Enzyme design. Structure first.
Site: not given
Ligand SMILES: O=C1c2cc(-c3ccc(O)cc3)cc(Cc3ccccc3)c2C[C@@H]1Cc1ccc(O)cc1
Length: 189
Positions: A16, A86, A132, A169, A184
């Site tokens: 994170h 978090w 994406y 996730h 990832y």
């Molecule tokens: O899971 C996801 C995740 C987690 C973090 C994250 C992680 C940890 C952190 O501490 C901060 C940001 C960051 C991202 C990138 C992002 C950040 C801000 C605005 C839009 C995208 C993404 C995408 C991706 C989207 C997703 C969600 C559910 C799904 O089923 C499939 C795709």
């Protein structure tokens, strides 16, 4: 599966912290809910052609997700308050997983995959996942995007759905499941 937290794991903190530094694009040492929701909505609207209805659904989901980590509009969240928030987010998500309650990470995926999937059936191809993650910047190389479809239990199409991604996730953001490593690729440690 795994429904126990592991917040003292230095690789969970480092995962994170990597994301925090990735999100702090202006090197302020602090990020806001305004910035996170802007980035998220900018992607689906200006890169992926989301309809206003889709964008509103996706906006509420991203807002809830980062809001679950304690971030608020007009508030700058530094790294100590970030990782502390978090821990509360992972704890609340783990309670939802256990109660078989829709988690914030699932609700975001459902709203997002409706945009990323051109057929709007909750399943995205590899090219759509490359579209994406590269627009989001969370993954840079096509090689790391392919690692996702190796780790995930892809269906027979083969496409990735929210069910499988929510499972990955769970172990990748919340519990440090060894089987969810490289979700990832090498883009996120
Ligand atoms: O899971 C996801 C995740 C987690 C973090 C994250 C992680 C940890 C952190 O501490 C901060 C940001 C960051 C991202 C990138 C992002 C950040 C801000 C605005 C839009 C995208 C993404 C995408 C991706 C989207 C997703 C969600 C559910 C799904 O089923 C499939 C795709």
């Amino acid at each position: 599966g795994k429904l126990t937290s592991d917040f003292d794991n230095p690789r969970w903190i480092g995962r994170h912290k990597h994301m925090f530094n990735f999100l702090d694009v202006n090197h302020n040492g602090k990020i806001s809910l305004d910035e996170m929701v802007y980035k998220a909505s900018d992607i689906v609207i200006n890169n992926l052609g989301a309809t206003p209805e889709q964008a509103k659904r996706h906006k509420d989901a991203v807002e809830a997700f980062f809001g679950g980590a304690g971030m608020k509009y007009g508030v700058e969240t530094d790294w100590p308050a970030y990782i502390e928030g978090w821990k509360k987010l992972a704890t609340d998500e783990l309670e939802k997983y256990a109660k078989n309650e829709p988690t914030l990470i699932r609700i975001w995926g459902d709203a997002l995959f409706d945009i990323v999937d051109k057929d709007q059936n909750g399943a995205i191809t590899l090219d759509e996942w490359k579209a994406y993650t590269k627009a989001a910047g969370i993954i840079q190389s096509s090689e790391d995007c392919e690692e996702t479809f190796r780790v995930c239990d892809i269906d027979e199409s083969g496409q990735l759905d929210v069910d499988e991604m929510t499972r990955q996730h769970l172990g990748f953001w919340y519990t440090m499941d060894p089987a969810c490593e490289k979700l990832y690729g090498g883009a996120v440690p």
